[PDB]
Design a protein around this ligand. Structure first.
Ligand SMILES: [Mg+2]
Ligand SMILES: [Mg+2]
Ligand SMILES: [Mg+2]
Ligand SMILES: [Mg+2]
Ligand SMILES: [Mg+2]
Ligand SMILES: [Mg+2]
Ligand SMILES: [Mg+2]
Ligand SMILES: [Mg+2]
Ligand SMILES: [Mg+2]
Ligand SMILES: [Mg+2]
Ligand SMILES: [Mg+2]
Ligand SMILES: [Mg+2]
Ligand SMILES: [Mg+2]
Ligand SMILES: [Mg+2]
Ligand SMILES: [Mg+2]
Ligand SMILES: [Mg+2]
Ligand SMILES: [Mg+2]
Ligand SMILES: [Mg+2]
Ligand SMILES: [Mg+2]
Ligand SMILES: [Mg+2]
Ligand SMILES: [Mg+2]
Ligand SMILES: [Mg+2]
Ligand SMILES: [Mg+2]
Ligand SMILES: [Zn+2]
Lengths: 97, 73, 165, 51, 98
RNA sequence: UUAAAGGAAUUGACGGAAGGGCACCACCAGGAGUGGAGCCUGCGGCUUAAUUUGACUCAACACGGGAAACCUCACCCGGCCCGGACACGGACAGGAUUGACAGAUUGAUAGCUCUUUCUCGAUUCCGUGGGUGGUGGUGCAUGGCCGUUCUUAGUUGGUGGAGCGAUUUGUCUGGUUAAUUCCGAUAACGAACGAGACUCUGGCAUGCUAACUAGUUACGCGACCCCCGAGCGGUAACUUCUUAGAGGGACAAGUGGCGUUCAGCCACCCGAGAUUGAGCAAUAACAGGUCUGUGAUGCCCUUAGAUGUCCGGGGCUGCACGCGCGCUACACUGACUGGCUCAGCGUGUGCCUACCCUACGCCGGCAGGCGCGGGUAACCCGUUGAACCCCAUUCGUGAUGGGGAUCGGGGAUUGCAAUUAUUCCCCAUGAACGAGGAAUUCCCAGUAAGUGCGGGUCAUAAGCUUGCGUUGAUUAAGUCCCUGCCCU
C-alpha cells in the first residue's frame, strides 16, 4: 500500500514529509522512505512581444514538479487513520492499495 | 482602402419573401346544413396528419409539419 | 472515470486559480478585493476570498457569497454543494497594493483629481507600516500628450530575486 | 437553410483560445490555451516563474 | 422566428430555480456544443437573456469566453413579472441561509 | 507700434569642440563564414479582379513564433443570415410573423427568386429613436507589454560649508576593478536606488537522510566452452553508480614579488573548482512598434443590397530584376557498401470538448497496411542500440560514382478536398558549382565549428527557432587607431 505525495514547492513538500515522519515513526509500522522522484520541468519559451520589433528576446518559464512516494504495508483501516492530516493546500495525496 | 464597393448594378432590384393569401380560407364544404364534405387530401399516419392536410399540385403531394413527400400518377 | 497526467493537472489547476481570481476581480471591483486561496479537499473544495470590505461579500441576507458559489458550481462542475466559499477580513488596508489600486480607481473615477488622490494614497500607505511606495499614473493627464506622473516615497528595492515577495 | 457547413474539425480555425477567442497566433498544446501575450502576465498566477 | 414553446419556459424556469446562468462566446458557426443543462446551445440562451440584460433586469459579467448572468434585488422585483405564472416561490439565493 | 527687449549667473538639451575611459554587436593575431553557384524563405519593384497588412541603420527584411488546399484570411468574385437588444408607433391580418415538396435559374437537395399552397402561433414585419459588431482608420490620443539608449554605470535626499538666490561641494587629482567597486586626498560626513549581494543550473564529497516506478555484491534456478576451483549473459545486505533533501566546500585565503598603512595585480601548492553560464535589473526618455492579442479604450466611418457574420472558389506562391537570414556541395582530411559502437534535455490516450507515444507478429521491395499489447508515465516505447566517429572494400583528379537543381512516369500515408505547392518512396533526366572581387557578420575554452535529437507549428510537418547531447582547435588576456557609447 503506497501513498504518493506531490507538492508544488519543495519547502512545503519537506515540511509535510517531516510531519508524516514525525506522525508515523512512533507507531508499530515499518515505515519506508520518502522515495525521491526526479524533478519534472515544463519549459515554455515565449516571444515576449506582441509585435516583431527588436532582438529575439525570449521568456523561459519553468515549473519544478516534485514527487514523493511512501510505502506502508498495513490493513486498510490504518491507512485512513494516517490519511487524516491537517495539510498544506499545495500538497496532493494519492493512495494505492 | 481607396477601392470603394459600389453598386455596379447588373441586378437592379430584388424583394424579400412576402407571404400573401386571400382574406379567409375555407377548407370545408357544407352538405345538408351540418355535414362536412372533405375536399383536400389528408396525410397518412406518421404523427403528422392528425390535423394537417395536403396541398394541391400538378403531380406531387406535400405535408406541412414534417414535410412528407408523396407522388402518384 | 477519467484522469489526466500530473504535468497537465497542475497547469489546469493554475488556470483555474487565475480564472477564478481574475473573474472575481472583474466582478467584485466594488468592495476591497485582495485575492483568493483555494484548498483542495475531495469532500469539500474550499475557496477563501481574502477581501478588505467583507460586508459586500457577506451581502444583505447572506446573498452574494452563495450566489457566487452557485456561479462557480454551475460552470466548473461541482454539484451537491462541493464548492464552499469563505470570506476573510483584511484589517491591514495599506498592505495590499491590489486593494490600494482598487481604491484609487474609484477615487480617480468620480472627480477627486490626480494630485490629491496620489498624495492621499501615499500618506495612507506610508502611515500603514510600509517602508516605501511608488505610484505611477500615466495616460491622457490634462493634455493631448501622455504625461507620465510618477510619485515615489520611502525605500524601494527594484532588482534581484526578493523583489517578488 | 444552410447554417453550418465547413466543419472546422482540425487546423488553425479549430483552435479557439481560452482568453479572447484569438486564432491568428498559435495556441500551444500543453494542457493550456493562451494567446502568448497574456501568458506573460498570467504565468505568475497559473504557476510559472522566470528563473 | 419563435422556437418551440418549451424553450422559453425551460430557460426562465431554470433561471427561476437557480438565478445563475452561464453561456460562452461560441455562437453556432464553427461548432455546435449544446448547453450543459438544457438542449438549446448558446444562441437561444443569448436571445432570451438579451431582453433581461438590456432592460436592466439581469446584470452581465464577461469572463474569457463566458457570459455570467447576475441577479439584482430589483432583478427579483422584476422577476415578480415572471412570478405571475407560478406561485410565489423564492429560489435558494435570498430565502434561507445555512 | 509693442509688454517686453535686455544684462550677469545656475541646471538641462544641443555642437559638425577638447580631454579621459569602455565595448570582439570596435580592432589587433586568428577561426568559421556570407557576399560566388543551386535551393529554401522574407523584403522592395513588377504583374494581377486579388496578389491583405505593418515594420525600413544597429533598434525592419525565416519579424508578427507569419509552415496558408477552405479554414488561418484581415484581399478579390458570386451567393445566404440577423444574433434589429430595448421603448413609442403603422398594418394587427375577421387568429395569415416563419419553414418547405416537385420544375426553371443557380455549385447547391440555399424556397435566393419565380409556377404552385400547406404548415408555424401575438416572441413577429415595417417606421421612428437608439443598440451591437468590425483583423475598418488613427500607436502623432492612449493603457499595458516589448525593444533601444543599456548590459554601459549612472542617479537622489538628511546635517554641514559657498553664494542674496536658482544651485553647488557631497557625486573626486591619482591608483585599481567588469563596474560611482574600493583605497586615498580631502569642505565634507553618515547614507539610498542600481552594479554586486539575491534565485536557478553546472562542477565536489561523506559507511548523513533512501528508494521492487533506480542499481550493486554474493547467491540459488539455469544456457554455453575448456573440461583445470575459471569466463560471459537470462530469470540476504548497501546506496558507490541513477534520482533528490539539508548541511558542508572557495574566501584572494598560505607563500614570494610588484604597491604610500594601503585599494589591488602577478607565480605555485592544497583543492573538484583560483571562479562558470543565466534570470531579475536605477532616475529618465525614443513623440521606436503593437487599436491586426483582448469583452483595454477615446475620436471618425459602416450598420441590412453591411467595413457585421456565414457558404463555394481564387489569392497571399503569382518573376525582365536587386537585397537579407539560412540549407547543400565544389571532393581523396573525400563519396559507396558491409561490420562495430556510445547520449542528454524533453514529449506521449478517451484533454474546460477531440485527441496522440508505440512494442510485438504477419504481408508488401519501399514509403505503408492489418491484429494484439503497454503507457495518464523513472513502470511502456527505452539499458532513446542517434549522427559524427572506428575497421575493411570500391572509386583515382574525370564536372567523376562530388553536387542532385530542373523534369517525366508509378505507388502509399493524413485531410472532405493537395491540382497554380503537401509529404514520402522507386526508376530516370543529371545544370551551374574548379573554394567565391569591393565589402561585411560572430567569437576567448567544452568556447567557435562539424554532427544528430526533442519541443513550438501540426492532421500530414522543417532548411525557421528554442533547448539538448557527440566530436571538438589555431590563436588574445592588450590598446584607443576604424565604429559606437559614457563622463568632465
Ligand atoms: Mg495616455
Ligand atoms: Mg498626445
Ligand atoms: Mg510610459
Ligand atoms: Mg496568425
Ligand atoms: Mg548672458
Ligand atoms: Mg561592426
Ligand atoms: Mg532567403
Ligand atoms: Mg518583390
Ligand atoms: Mg525583407
Ligand atoms: Mg519584424
Ligand atoms: Mg481590407
Ligand atoms: Mg484587420
Ligand atoms: Mg487609435
Ligand atoms: Mg547658506
Ligand atoms: Mg552635482
Ligand atoms: Mg548515481
Ligand atoms: Mg528606465
Ligand atoms: Mg465590454
Ligand atoms: Mg536562404
Ligand atoms: Mg536548408
Ligand atoms: Mg489536439
Ligand atoms: Mg519535379
Ligand atoms: Mg497541431
Ligand atoms: Zn484568447
Amino acid at each position: 500500500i503506497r501513498i504518493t505525495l506531490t507538492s508544488r514547492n519543495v519547502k512545503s513538500l519537506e515540511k509535510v514529509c517531516a510531519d508524516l515522519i514525525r506522525g508515523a515513526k512512533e507507531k508499530n509500522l515499518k515505515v519506508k522512505g520518502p522515495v525521491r522522484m526526479p524533478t519534472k520541468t515544463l519549459r515554455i519559451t515565449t516571444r515576449k512581444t506582441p509585435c516583431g520589433e527588436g532582438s529575439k528576446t525570449w521568456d523561459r518559464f519553468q515549473m519544478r514538479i516534485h514527487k514523493r512516494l511512501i510505502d506502508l504495508h498495513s490493513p486498510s483501516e490504518i491507512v485512513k487513520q494516517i490519511t487524516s492530516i491537517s495539510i498544506e493546500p499545495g500538497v496532493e495525496v494519492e493512495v494505492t492499495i | 482602402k481607396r477601392k470603394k464597393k459600389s453598386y455596379t448594378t447588373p441586378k437592379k432590384n430584388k424583394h424579400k419573401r412576402k407571404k400573401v393569401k386571400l382574406a379567409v380560407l375555407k377548407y370545408y364544404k357544407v352538405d345538408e346544413n351540418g355535414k362536412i364534405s372533405r375536399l383536400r387530401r389528408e396525410c397518412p399516419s406518421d404523427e403528422c396528419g392528425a390535423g394537417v392536410f395536403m396541398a394541391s399540385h400538378f403531380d406531387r403531394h406535400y405535408c406541412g409539419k414534417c414535410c412528407l413527400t408523396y407522388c402518384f400518377n | 472515470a477519467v484522469q489526466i497526467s500530473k504535468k497537465r493537472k497542475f497547469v489546469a489547476d493554475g488556470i483555474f486559480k487565475a480564472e477564478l481570481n481574475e473573474f472575481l476581480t472583474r466582478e467584485l471591483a466594488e468592495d476591497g478585493y485582495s485575492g483568493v486561496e483555494v484548498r483542495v479537499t475531495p469532500t469539500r473544495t474550499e475557496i477563501i476570498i481574502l477581501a478588505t470590505r467583507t460586508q459586500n461579500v457577506l451581502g444583505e441576507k447572506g446573498r452574494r457569497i452563495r450566489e457566487l458559489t452557485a456561479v462557480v458550481q454551475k460552470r466548473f462542475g461541482f454539484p451537491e454543494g462541493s464548492v464552499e466559499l469563505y470570506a476573510e477580513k483584511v484589517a491591514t488596508r495599506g498592505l495590499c497594493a491590489i486593494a490600494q489600486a482598487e481604491s484609487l480607481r474609484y477615487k480617480l473615477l468620480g472627480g477627486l483629481a490626480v494630485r490629491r488622490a496620489c498624495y492621499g494614497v501615499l500618506r495612507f500607505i506610508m502611515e500603514s507600516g510600509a517602508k516605501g511606495c511608488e505610484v505611477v499614473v500615466s495616460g491622457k493627464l490634462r493634455g493631448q500628450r501622455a504625461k507620465s506622473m510618477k510619485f515615489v516615497d520611502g525605500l524601494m528595492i527594484h532588482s534581484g530575486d526578493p523583489v517578488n515577495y | 437553410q444552410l447554417y453550418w457547413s465547413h466543419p472546422r474539425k482540425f487546423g488553425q480555425g479549430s483552435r479557439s483560445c481560452r482568453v479572447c477567442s484569438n486564432r491568428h497566433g498559435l495556441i500551444r498544446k500543453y494542457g493550456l490555451n493562451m494567446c502568448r501575450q497574456c501568458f506573460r502576465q498570467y504565468a505568475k498566477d497559473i504557476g510559472f516563474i522566470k528563473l | 422566428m419563435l422556437m418551440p414553446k418549451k424553450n422559453r419556459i425551460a430557460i426562465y424556469e431554470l433561471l427561476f430555480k437557480e438565478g445563475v446562468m452561464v453561456a460562452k462566446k461560441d455562437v453556432h458557426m464553427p461548432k455546435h456544443p449544446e448547453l450543459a443543462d438544457k438542449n438549446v446551445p448558446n444562441l437561444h440562451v443569448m436571445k432570451a437573456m438579451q431582453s433581461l440584460k438590456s432592460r436592466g433586469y439581469v446584470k452581465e459579467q464577461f469572463a474569457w469566453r463566458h457570459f455570467y448572468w447576475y441577479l439584482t434585488n430589483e432583478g427579483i422585483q422584476y422577476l415578480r413579472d415572471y412570478l405571475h405564472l407560478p406561485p410565489e416561490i423564492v429560489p435558494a439565493t435570498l430565502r434561507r441561509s445555512r
